[PDB]
Structure formats: structure tokens, C-alpha cells
Amino acid sequence: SATDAFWAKYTACESARNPREKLNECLEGNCAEGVGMNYRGNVSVTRSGIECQLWRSRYPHKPEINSTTHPGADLRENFCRNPDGSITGPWCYTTSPTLRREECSVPVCGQDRVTVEVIPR
Numbered sequence: 001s002a003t004d005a006f007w008a009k010y011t012a013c014e015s016a017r018n019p020r021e022k023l024n025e026c027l028e029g030n031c032a033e034g035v036g037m038n039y040r041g042n043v044s045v046t047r048s049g050i051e052c053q054l055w056r057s058r059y060p061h062k063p064e065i066n067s068t069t070h071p072g073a074d075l076r077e078n079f080c081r082n083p084d085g086s087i088t089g090p091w092c093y094t095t096s097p098t099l100r101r102e103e104c105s106v107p108v109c110g111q112d113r114v115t116v117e118v119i120p121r
Helices: 004-013 022-027
Strands: 091-093 099-103
Touching: none
Parallel strands: none
Antiparallel strands: 091 099
């Protein structure tokens, strides 16, 4: 990227961007800013208890999204991402053969809560 590079980040952090606290936190990948483009977390499981598959690991599911199309997105071994712009949030491809994909529960930035509720045992 470069300046496509600055927009990528700028876009993703347009809402948390005024106060430097609010805006760094965002670039600091750790919590989700609206649907979670800003997110360089560390959460390897879906909201239901399932273990995310590797981004390059391409079995049980073959991903259309691949770090080889989403220069963008940090499709770093099996963490939870949001390379598309999903309403539900940073998601991941499950390792359960009948669950292609599911979102992940992640810390929101600022008003701490959870992106989506985690399913009980």
C-alpha cells in the first residue's frame, strides 16, 4: 500500500479518531471500532467455543479470503480478523467441519463490552 495504506487505517479508525487516546488505541490492534476493521488482536476462538482454523491452513474449509487478496487485513495464522467489512464483526473460519465461519467475541474500544455475546458451553 502506501497512501492506500493510510486510508486503510484511517478508514478503519474514522469513528475513534479525534482524541489521540481514542485514535491510537484503534491503530493499536486490541479492540474493535464499529464492525472491527481496526483489530490486530489475539483471539483464536469463535464466540461459540470453536477453535479458529489457520488462514493458510486450507482444510476443513477453503477460504475465499486469503492473505493473498487482503493485503490489507492481518491474516496472521488463525487469529480473528474482519478483512471484508462484516456487520457481525472480526470473525474466523472454524475448525468444526460444519461451521465455515463464525464471529469472535472481542473487546470493543473505549466502551468496553463485547462485540457479540459468547454462546454457553
